mmCIF file of C-alpha atoms in Angstrom:
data_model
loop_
_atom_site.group_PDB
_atom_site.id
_atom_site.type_symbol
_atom_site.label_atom_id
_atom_site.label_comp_id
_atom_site.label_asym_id
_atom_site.label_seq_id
_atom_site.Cartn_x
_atom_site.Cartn_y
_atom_site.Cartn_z
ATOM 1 C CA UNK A 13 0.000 0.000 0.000
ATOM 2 C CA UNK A 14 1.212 3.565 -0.520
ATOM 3 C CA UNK A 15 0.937 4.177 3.024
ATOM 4 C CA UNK A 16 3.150 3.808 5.984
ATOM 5 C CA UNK A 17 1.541 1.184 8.769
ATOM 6 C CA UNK A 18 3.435 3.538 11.540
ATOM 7 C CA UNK A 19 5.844 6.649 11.685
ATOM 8 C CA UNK A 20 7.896 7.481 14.261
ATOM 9 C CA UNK A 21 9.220 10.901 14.914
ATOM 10 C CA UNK A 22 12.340 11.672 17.329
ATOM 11 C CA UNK A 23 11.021 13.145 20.267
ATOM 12 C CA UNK A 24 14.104 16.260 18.794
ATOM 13 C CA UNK A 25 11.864 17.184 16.234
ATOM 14 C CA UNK A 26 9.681 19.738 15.714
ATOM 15 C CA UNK A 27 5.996 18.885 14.955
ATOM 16 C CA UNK A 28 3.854 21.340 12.584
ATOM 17 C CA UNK A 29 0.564 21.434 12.276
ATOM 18 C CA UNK A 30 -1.670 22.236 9.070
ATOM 19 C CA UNK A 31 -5.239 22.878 9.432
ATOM 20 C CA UNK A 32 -7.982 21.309 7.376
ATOM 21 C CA UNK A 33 -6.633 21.629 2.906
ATOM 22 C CA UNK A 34 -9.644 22.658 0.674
ATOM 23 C CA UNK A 35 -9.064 22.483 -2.827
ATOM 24 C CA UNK A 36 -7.980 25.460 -5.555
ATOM 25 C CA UNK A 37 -10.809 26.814 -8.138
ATOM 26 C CA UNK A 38 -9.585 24.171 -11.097
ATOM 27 C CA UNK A 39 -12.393 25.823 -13.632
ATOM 28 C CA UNK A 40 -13.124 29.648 -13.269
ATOM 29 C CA UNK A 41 -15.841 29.084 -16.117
ATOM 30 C CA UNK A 42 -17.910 26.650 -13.817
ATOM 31 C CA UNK A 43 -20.631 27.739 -11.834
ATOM 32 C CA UNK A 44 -19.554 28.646 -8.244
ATOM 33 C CA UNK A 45 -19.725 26.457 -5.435
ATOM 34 C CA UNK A 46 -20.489 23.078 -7.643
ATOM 35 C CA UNK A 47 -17.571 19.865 -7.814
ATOM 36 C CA UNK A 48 -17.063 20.873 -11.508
ATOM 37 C CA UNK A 49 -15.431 24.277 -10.394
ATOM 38 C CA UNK A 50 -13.161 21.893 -8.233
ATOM 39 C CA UNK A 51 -12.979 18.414 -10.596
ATOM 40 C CA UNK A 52 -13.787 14.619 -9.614
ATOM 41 C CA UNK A 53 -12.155 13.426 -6.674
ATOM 42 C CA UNK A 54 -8.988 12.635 -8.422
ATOM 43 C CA UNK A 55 -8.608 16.064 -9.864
ATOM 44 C CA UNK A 56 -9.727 17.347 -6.154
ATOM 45 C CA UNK A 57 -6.839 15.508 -4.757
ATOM 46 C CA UNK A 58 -4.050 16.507 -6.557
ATOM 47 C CA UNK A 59 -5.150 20.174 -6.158
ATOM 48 C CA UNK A 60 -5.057 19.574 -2.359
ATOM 49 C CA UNK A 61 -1.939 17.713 -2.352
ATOM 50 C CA UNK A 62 -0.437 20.460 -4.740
ATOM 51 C CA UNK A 63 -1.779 23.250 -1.840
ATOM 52 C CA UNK A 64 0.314 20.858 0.687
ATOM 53 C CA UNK A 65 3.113 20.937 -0.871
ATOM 54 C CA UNK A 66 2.530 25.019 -1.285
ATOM 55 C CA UNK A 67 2.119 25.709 2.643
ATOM 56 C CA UNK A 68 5.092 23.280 3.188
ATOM 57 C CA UNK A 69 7.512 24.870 1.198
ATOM 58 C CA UNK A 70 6.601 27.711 2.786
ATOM 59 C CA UNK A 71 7.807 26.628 5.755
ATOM 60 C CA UNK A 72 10.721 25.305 3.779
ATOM 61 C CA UNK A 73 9.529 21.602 4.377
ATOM 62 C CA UNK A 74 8.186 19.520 1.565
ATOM 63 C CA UNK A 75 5.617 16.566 1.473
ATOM 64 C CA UNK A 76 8.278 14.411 2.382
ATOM 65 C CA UNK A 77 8.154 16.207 6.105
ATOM 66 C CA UNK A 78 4.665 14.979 6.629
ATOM 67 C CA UNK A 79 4.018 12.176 9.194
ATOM 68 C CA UNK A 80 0.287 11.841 9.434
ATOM 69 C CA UNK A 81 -2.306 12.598 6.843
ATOM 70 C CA UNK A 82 -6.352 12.428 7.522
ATOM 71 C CA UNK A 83 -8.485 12.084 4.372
ATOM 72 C CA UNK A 84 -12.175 12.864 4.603
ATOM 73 C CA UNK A 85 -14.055 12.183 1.725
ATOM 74 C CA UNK A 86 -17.827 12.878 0.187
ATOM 75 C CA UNK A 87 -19.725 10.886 -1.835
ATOM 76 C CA UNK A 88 -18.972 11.082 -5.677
ATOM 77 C CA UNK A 89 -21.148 10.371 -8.290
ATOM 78 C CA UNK A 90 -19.262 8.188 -10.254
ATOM 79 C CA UNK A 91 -19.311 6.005 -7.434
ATOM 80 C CA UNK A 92 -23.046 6.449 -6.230
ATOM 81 C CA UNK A 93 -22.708 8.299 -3.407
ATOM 82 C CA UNK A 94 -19.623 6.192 -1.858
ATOM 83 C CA UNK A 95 -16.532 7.723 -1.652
ATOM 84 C CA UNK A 96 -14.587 7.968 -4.556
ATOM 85 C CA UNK A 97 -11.548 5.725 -2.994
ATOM 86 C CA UNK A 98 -9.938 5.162 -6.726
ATOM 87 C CA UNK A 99 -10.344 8.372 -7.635
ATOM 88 C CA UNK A 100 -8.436 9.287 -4.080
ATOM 89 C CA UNK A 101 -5.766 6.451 -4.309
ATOM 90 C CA UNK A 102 -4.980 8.060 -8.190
ATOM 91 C CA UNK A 103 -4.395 11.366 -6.874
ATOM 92 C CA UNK A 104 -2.464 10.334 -4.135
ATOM 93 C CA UNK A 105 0.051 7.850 -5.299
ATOM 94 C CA UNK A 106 1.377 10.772 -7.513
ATOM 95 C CA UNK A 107 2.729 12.484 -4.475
ATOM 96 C CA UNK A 108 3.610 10.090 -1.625
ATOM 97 C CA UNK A 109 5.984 7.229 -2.570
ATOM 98 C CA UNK A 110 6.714 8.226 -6.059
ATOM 99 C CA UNK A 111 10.710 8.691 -7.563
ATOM 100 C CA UNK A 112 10.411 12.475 -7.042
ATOM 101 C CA UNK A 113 8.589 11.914 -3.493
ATOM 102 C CA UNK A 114 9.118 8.336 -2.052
ATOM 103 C CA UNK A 115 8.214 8.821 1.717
ATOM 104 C CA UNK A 116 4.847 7.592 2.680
ATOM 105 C CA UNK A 117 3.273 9.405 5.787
ATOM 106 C CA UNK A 118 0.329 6.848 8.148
ATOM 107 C CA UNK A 119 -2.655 7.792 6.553
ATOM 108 C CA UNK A 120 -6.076 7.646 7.786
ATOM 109 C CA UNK A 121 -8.994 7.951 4.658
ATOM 110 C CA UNK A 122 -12.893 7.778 5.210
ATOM 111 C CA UNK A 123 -16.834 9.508 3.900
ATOM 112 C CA UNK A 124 -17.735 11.984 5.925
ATOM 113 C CA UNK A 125 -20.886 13.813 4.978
ATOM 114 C CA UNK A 126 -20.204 17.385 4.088
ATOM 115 C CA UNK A 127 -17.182 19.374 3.717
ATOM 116 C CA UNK A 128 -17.668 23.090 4.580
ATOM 117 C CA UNK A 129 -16.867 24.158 1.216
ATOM 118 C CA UNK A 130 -19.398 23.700 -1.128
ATOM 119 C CA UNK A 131 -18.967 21.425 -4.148
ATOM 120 C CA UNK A 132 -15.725 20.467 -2.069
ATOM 121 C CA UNK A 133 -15.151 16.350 -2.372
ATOM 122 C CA UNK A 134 -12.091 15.967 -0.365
ATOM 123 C CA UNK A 135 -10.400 17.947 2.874
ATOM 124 C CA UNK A 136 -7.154 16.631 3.957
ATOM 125 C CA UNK A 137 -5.481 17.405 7.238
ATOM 126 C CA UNK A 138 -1.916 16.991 8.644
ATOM 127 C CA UNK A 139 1.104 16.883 10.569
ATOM 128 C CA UNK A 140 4.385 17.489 9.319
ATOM 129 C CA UNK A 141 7.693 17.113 10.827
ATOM 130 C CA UNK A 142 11.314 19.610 11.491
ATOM 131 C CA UNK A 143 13.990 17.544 11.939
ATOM 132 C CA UNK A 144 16.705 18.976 14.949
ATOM 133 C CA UNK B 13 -9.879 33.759 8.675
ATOM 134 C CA UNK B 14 -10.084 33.301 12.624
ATOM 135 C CA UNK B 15 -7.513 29.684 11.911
ATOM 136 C CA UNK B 16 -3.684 29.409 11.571
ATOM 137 C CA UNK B 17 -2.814 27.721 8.251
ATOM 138 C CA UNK B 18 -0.084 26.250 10.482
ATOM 139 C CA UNK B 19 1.351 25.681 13.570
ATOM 140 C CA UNK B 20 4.565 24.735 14.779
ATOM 141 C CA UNK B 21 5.137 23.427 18.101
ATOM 142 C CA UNK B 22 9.266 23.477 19.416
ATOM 143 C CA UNK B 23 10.169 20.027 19.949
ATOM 144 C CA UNK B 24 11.304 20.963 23.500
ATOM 145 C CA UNK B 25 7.404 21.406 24.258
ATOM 146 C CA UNK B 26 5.211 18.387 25.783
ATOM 147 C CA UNK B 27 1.644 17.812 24.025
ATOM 148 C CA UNK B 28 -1.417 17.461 25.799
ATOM 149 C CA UNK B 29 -3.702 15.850 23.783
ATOM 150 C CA UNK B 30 -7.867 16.177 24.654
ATOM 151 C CA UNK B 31 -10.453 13.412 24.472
ATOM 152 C CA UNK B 32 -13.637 14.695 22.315
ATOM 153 C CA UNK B 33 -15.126 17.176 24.231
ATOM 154 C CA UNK B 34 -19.550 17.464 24.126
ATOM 155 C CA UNK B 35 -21.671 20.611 25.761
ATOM 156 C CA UNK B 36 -22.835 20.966 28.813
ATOM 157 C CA UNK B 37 -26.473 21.153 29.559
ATOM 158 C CA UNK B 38 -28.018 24.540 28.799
ATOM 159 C CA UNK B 39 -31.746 24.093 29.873
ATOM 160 C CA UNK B 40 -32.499 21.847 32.767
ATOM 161 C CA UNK B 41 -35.772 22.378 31.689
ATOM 162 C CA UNK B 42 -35.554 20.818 28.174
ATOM 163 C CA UNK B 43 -36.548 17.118 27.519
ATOM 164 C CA UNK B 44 -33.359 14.833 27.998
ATOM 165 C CA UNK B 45 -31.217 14.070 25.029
ATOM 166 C CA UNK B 46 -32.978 16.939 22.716
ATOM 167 C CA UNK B 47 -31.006 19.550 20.807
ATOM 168 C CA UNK B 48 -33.151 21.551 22.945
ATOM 169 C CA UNK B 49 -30.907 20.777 25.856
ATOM 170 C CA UNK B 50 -28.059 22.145 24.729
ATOM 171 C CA UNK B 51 -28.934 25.037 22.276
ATOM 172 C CA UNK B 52 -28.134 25.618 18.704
ATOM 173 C CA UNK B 53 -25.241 25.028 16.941
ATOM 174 C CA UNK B 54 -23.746 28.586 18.291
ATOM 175 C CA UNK B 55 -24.706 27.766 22.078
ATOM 176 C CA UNK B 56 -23.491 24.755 21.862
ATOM 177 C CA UNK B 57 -20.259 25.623 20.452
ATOM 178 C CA UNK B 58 -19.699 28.627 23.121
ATOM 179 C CA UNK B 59 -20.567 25.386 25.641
ATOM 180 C CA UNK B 60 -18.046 23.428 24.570
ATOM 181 C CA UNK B 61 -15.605 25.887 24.292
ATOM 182 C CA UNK B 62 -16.115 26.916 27.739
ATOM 183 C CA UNK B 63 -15.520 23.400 28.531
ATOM 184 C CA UNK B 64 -12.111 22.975 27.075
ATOM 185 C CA UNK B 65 -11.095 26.393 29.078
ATOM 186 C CA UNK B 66 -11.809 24.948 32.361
ATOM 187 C CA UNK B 67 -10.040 21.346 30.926
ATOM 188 C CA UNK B 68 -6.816 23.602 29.751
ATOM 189 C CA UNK B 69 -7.281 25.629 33.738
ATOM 190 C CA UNK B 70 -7.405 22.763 35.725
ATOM 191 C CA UNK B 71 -3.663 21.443 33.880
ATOM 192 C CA UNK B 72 -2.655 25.602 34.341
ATOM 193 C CA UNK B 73 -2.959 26.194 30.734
ATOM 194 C CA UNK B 74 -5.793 28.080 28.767
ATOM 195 C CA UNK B 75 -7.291 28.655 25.265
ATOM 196 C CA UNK B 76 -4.250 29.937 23.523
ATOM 197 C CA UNK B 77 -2.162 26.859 24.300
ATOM 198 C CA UNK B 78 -4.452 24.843 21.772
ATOM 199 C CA UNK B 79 -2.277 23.933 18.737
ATOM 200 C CA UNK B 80 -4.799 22.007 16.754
ATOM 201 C CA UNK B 81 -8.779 21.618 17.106
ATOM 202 C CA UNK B 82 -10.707 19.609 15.389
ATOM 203 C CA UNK B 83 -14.509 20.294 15.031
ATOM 204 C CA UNK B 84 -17.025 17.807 14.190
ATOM 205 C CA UNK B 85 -20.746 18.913 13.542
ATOM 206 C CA UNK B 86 -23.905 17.199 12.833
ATOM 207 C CA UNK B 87 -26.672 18.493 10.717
ATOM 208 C CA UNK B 88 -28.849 21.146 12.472
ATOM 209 C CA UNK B 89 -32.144 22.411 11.604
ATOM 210 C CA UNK B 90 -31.686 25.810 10.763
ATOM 211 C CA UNK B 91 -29.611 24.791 8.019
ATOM 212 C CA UNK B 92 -31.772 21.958 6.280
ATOM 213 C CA UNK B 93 -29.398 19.374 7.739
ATOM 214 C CA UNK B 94 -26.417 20.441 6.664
ATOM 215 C CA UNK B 95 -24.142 21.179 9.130
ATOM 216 C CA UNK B 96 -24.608 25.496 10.896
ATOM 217 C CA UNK B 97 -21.362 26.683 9.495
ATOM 218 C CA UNK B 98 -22.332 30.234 10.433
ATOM 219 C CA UNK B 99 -23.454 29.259 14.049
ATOM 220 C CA UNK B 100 -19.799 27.327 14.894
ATOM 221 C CA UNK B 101 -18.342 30.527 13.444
ATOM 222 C CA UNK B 102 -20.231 32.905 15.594
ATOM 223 C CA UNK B 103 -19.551 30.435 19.182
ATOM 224 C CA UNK B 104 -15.590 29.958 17.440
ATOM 225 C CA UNK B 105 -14.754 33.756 16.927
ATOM 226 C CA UNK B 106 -15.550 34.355 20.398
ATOM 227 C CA UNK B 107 -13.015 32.483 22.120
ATOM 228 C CA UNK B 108 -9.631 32.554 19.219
ATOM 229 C CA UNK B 109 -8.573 35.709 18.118
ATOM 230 C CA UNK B 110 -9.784 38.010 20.362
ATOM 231 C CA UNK B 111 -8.143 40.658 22.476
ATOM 232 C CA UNK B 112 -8.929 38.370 24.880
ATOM 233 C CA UNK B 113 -7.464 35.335 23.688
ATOM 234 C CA UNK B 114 -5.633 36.703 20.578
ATOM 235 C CA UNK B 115 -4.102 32.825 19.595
ATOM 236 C CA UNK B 116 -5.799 30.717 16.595
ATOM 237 C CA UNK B 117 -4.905 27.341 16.359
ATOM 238 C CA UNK B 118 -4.924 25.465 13.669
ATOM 239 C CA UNK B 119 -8.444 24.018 13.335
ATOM 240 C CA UNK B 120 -10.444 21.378 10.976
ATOM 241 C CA UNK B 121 -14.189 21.142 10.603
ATOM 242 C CA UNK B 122 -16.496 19.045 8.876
ATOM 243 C CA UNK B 123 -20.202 16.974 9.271
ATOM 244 C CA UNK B 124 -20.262 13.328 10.737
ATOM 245 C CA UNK B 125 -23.400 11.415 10.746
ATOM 246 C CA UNK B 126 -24.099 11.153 14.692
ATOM 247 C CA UNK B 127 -22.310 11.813 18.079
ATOM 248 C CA UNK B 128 -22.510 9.378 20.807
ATOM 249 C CA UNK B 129 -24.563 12.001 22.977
ATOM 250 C CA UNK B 130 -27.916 12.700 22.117
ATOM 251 C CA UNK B 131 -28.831 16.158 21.414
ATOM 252 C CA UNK B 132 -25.233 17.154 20.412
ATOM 253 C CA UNK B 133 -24.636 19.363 17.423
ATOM 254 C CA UNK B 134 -20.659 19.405 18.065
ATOM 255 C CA UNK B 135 -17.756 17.600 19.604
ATOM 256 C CA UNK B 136 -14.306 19.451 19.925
ATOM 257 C CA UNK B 137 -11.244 17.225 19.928
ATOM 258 C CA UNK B 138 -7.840 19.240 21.023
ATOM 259 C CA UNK B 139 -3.964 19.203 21.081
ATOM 260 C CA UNK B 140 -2.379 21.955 23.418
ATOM 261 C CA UNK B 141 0.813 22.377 24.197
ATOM 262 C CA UNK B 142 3.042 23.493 27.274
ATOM 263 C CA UNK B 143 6.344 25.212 26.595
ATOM 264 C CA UNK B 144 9.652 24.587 28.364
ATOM 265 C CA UNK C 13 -15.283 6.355 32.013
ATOM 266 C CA UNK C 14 -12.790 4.140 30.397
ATOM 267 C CA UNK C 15 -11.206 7.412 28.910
ATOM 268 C CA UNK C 16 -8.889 9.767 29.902
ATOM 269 C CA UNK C 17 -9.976 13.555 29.341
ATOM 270 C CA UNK C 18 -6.445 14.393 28.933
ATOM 271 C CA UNK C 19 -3.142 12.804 28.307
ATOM 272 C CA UNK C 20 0.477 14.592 28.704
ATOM 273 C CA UNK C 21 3.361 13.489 26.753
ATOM 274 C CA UNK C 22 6.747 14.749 28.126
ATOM 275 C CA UNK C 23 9.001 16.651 25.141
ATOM 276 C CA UNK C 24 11.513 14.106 25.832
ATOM 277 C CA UNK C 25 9.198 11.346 24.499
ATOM 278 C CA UNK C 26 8.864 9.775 20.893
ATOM 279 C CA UNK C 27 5.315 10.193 18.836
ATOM 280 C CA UNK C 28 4.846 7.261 17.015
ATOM 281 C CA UNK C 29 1.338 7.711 14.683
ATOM 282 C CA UNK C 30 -0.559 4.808 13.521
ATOM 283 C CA UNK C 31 -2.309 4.754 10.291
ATOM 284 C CA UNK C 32 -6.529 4.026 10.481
ATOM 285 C CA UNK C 33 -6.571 0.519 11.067
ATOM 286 C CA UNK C 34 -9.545 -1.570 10.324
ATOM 287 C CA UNK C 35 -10.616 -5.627 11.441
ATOM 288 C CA UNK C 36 -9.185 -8.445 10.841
ATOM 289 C CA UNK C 37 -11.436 -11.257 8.370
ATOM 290 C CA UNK C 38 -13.213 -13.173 12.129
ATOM 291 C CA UNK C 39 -15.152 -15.398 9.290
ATOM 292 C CA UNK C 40 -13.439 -17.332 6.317
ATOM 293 C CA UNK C 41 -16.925 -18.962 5.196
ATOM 294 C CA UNK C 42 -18.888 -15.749 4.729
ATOM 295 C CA UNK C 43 -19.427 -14.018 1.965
ATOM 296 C CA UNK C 44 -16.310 -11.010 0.902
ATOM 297 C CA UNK C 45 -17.118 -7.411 2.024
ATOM 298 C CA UNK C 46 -20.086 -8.402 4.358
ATOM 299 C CA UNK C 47 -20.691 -7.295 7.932
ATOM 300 C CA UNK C 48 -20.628 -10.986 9.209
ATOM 301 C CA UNK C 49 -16.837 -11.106 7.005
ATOM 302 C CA UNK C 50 -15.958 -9.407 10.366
ATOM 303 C CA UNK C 51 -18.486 -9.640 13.083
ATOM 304 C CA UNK C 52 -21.019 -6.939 14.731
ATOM 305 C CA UNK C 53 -19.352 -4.046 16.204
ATOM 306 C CA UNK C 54 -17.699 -5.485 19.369
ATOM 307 C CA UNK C 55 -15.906 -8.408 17.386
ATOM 308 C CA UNK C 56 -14.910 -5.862 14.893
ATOM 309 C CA UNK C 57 -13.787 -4.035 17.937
ATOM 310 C CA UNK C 58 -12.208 -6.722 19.835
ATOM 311 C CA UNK C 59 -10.139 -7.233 15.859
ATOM 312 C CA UNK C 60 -8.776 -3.692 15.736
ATOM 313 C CA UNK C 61 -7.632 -3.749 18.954
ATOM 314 C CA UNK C 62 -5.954 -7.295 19.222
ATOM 315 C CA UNK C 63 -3.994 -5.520 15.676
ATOM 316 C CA UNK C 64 -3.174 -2.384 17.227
ATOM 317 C CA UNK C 65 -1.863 -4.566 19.617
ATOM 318 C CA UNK C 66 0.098 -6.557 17.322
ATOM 319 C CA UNK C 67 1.060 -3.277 15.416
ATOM 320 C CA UNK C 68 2.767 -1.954 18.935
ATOM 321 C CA UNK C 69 4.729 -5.269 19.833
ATOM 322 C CA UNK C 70 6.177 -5.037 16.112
ATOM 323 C CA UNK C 71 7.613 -1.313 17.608
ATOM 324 C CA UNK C 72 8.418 -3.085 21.333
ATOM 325 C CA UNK C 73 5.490 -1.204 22.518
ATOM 326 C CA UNK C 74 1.784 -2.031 23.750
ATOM 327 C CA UNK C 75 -1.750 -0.590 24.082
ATOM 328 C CA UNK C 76 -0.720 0.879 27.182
ATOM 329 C CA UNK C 77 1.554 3.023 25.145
ATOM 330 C CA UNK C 78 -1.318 4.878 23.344
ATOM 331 C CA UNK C 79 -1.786 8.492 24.089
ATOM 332 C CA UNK C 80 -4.358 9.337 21.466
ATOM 333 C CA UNK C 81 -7.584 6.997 20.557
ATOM 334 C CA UNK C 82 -9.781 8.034 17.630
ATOM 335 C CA UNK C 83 -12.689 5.613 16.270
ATOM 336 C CA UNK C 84 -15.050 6.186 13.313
ATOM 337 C CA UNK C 85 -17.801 3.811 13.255
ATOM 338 C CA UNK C 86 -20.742 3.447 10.499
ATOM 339 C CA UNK C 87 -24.311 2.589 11.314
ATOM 340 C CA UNK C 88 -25.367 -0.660 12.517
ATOM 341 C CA UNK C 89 -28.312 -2.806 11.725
ATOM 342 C CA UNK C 90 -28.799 -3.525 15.687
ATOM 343 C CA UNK C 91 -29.116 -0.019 16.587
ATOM 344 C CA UNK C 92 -31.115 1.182 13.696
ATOM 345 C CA UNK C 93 -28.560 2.441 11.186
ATOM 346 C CA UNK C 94 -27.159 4.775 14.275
ATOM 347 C CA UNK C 95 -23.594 3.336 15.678
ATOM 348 C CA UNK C 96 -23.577 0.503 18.307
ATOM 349 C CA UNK C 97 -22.182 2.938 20.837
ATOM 350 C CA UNK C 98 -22.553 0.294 23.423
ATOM 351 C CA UNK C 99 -20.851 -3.000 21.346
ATOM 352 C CA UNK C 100 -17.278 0.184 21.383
ATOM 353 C CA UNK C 101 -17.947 -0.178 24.408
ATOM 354 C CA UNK C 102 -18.274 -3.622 25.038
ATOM 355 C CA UNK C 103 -15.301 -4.632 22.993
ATOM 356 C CA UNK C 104 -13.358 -1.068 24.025
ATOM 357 C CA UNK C 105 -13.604 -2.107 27.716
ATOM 358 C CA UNK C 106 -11.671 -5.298 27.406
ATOM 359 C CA UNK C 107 -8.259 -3.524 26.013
ATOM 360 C CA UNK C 108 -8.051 -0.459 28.429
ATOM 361 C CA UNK C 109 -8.429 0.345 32.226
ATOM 362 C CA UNK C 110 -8.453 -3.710 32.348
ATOM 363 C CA UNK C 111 -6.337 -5.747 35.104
ATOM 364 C CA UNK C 112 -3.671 -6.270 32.322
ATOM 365 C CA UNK C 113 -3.972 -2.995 30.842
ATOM 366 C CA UNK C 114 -4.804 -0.361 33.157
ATOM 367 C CA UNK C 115 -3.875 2.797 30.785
ATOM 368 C CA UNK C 116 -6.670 5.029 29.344
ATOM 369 C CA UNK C 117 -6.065 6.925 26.383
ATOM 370 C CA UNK C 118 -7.473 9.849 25.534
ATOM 371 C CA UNK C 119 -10.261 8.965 23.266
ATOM 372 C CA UNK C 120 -13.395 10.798 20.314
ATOM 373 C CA UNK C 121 -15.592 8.360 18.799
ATOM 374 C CA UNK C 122 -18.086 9.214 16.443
ATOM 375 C CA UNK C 123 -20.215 7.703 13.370
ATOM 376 C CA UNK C 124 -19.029 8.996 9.450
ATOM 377 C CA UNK C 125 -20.939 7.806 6.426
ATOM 378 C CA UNK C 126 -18.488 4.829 5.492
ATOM 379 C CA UNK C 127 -15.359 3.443 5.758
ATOM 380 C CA UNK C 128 -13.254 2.214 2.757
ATOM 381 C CA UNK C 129 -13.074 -1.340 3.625
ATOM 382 C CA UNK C 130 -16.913 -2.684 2.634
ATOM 383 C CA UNK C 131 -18.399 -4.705 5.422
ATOM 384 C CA UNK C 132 -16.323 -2.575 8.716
ATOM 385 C CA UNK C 133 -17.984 -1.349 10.931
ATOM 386 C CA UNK C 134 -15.488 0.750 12.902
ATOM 387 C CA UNK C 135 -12.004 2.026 12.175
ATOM 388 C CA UNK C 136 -9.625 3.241 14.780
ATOM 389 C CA UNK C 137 -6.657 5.854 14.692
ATOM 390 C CA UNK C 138 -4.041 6.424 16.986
ATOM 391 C CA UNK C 139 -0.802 7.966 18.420
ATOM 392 C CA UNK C 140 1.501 6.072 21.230
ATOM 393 C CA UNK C 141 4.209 7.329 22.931
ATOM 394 C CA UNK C 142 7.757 5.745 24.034
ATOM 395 C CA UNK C 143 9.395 7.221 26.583
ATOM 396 C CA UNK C 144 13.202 8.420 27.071
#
């Protein structure tokens, strides 16, 4: 799986934070507030993980840094009103144990049902790590 | 917004980390269990919040030493059964970034299906932390 | 209750965060992706637990070494399609505050629309600490 079972940070490092991750506008011609001004899940996800990777390097950490990621999904649908897990799993696995980015944070992934964003699909939350 | 994108906690601080936290009872008067019990989304919120201060007291820390909330609502029915975005807000802005109690944490919020309590529009789960 | 409302973790301690971790197959003769796969929700309880469990011992640690308990469950048919607060329980009750393991975590537990394995009915989260 493209997720790490456990991860264990040095009690020397420092932890960071990152609230809830909403994704970016992907379609400014779509009608506002509806998924297709956001994409499927898939697109969803990489926008979010994209936005990660924004507020990391900001801190001058990278995707790499984070230790736990929390997934909460809404129904798609493509997939009748289930969470869009494929959709998910092909976003993700192009940032988290890939060539360019091969560390693989624990990662917990589930439907809630409603994200405060409307036609949001996917909010992802996390906790990075500073090394000393 | 009244939330910290991020934030970073020095490895030389300890975490205290704070089972979900529910409202108190607002109306002794109300039927058990009811929504009615414990207010709208807003009172409940200001409830719960209230809650955590006196948690954070009795360990000699307060509001401000929160590093992460997370904010779990159920559908209320002012809002059709979506979750009252605009009622958390109004019970959140009063305790984070205030003169007050000028310190956001970073903070996640979204709609479950059900809290174990009956009645409950909100549960607050917390990470604070205590510097050196 | 079999919860702590706070934990501390001393700064000199190690976080070690566990991924959402879901039941282990209690039936080999029923049918793939069912409820009964697994059990009701205090087998599938009594599973997760016995793994986190197994998950710790893999790190030389144990359940008593959990700081931070998180479990989303999905509706149940025994309990209406609300969660089978009281089969946590049941199941919960037999891993912490026990004779053999006397150590409460801090603990939220709430019902979300689905999880991504089909036929589980509760998946559990969770950080554990090891000590200088």
């Amino acid at each position: 799986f493209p997720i790490s079972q456990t991860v264990t940070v040095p009690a020397s490092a420092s932890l960071i934070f990152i609230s809830g991750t909403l994704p970016d506008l992907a379609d400014p011609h779509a009608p506002a507030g509806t998924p297709a001004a956001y994409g499927n899940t898939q697109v969803q996800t990489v926008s979010v993980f994209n936005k990660l990777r924004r507020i990391l390097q900001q801190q001058d950490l990278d995707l790499g840094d984070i230790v736990q990621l929390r997934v909460f999904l809404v129904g798609a649908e493509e997939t009748g009103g289930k969470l869009d897990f494929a959709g998910l799993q092909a976003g993700y696995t192009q940032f988290f144990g890939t060539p360019e980015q091969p560390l693989k944070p624990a990662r917990t992934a589930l439907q809630v049902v409603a994200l405060p964003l409307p036609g949001a699909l996917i909010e992802v939350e996390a906790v990075a790590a500073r090394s000393a």
